[PDB]
Amino acid sequence: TMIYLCADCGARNTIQAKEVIRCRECGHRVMYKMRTKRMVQFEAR
């Protein structure tokens, strides 16, 4: 479902519905969302 990044590893963690937020190689309880799939356009001015 949703993939987060272990704030220490950066490893992809597939947390599910109502599961403790923890890193499975790094036990870290802080993870980050991943960059959206939407199109990102910036003008260079």
Binding site: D8, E25, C26, G27
Partner: peptide, 16 residues
């Protein structure tokens, strides 16, 4: 204390 702090910081993954 410095050595103990170093030990605790480096192994935070193992000690977790």
């Amino acid at each position: 204390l410095g050595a103990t702090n170093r030990e605790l910081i480096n192994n935070r993954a193992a000690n977790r």
